[PDB]
Amino acid sequence: AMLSFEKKYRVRGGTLIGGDLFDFWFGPFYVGFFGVTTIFFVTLGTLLCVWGAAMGPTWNLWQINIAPPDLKYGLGLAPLREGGLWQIITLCALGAFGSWALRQAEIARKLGMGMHIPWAYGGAILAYTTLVVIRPFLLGAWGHGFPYGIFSHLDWVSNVGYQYLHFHYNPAHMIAVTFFFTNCLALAMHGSLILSVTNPPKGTPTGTSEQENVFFRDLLGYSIGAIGIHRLGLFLAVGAAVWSAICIVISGPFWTQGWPEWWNWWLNLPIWK
């Protein structure tokens, strides 16, 4: 099925790889070559996750836990029942996420859109790749990755934080948190403003960009304007993921002590040492 205006947009062309070969739709979905590789990796990864659940102690969704190998295996593939399965699933994940971003690029090219969406998603892929590839590689063992399990990965997050005694004191983490919180505030204001001009109280005329601009300017003192708020929301949301990648990659590979004692440089500035 198609939207009432959709058919004239369903042209050939805009692919990166494969040409006409996969240039077709399946229901709502665009396929393409990277659609085919997406489904391959998604399917292989998901079934290996189900296999991980089957050989683990429970089918309880919250408790399934496919763990990485012991650190002793270093950068090798471990035995599959001893964490090698987590490694194969990680390759499927990297393939699925990369295929998704390239399929987004093919869709955007077909619609004559800018490449903003694929690159914005690249921010999230960077954080995932930091957690399971880059940081474990810098530490010299794949066993530093997080386990695949809805709550067991939260146990990993807890323990990694307390490896540095007081992870709130990590300076890149403070920035990352500030971006996440500021993003959520900005999203609530942008949503509210557009809705409040487009859905005014009954019997009021539809609002305008001028009213939105005036109100916003009483909130922050300055006008952000229409393109400015979308630049800001993109800067905040993607910057949050980039600073997250920074805050975790410096924890271990570069800083090994507790995070509170990193702040010793501030106490010893020569003006007040």
Partner: protein, 60 residues
């Protein structure tokens, strides 16, 4: 009975059916393979008298 295919496009039903049957079969095989009694890759050569059985209620 055949008028069901006037109501539904058979070309769509066969997609839905194959999808459903594929997932269902994978579910049932993985459920059995996770069991103790039917973990046939490790224990399939055991005779039915030798295969695991879950715990009884104790009598008292």
């Amino acid at each position: 009975m055949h008028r069901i295919w006037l109501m539904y496009d058979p070309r769509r039903v066969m997609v839905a059916l194959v999808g459903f049957l594929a997932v269902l079969a994978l579910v049932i095989h993985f459920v059995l393979l996770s069991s103790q009694r039917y973990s046939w890759i490790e224990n399939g050569t055991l005779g039915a008298d030798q295969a695991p059985v879950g715990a009884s209620a104790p009598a008292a």
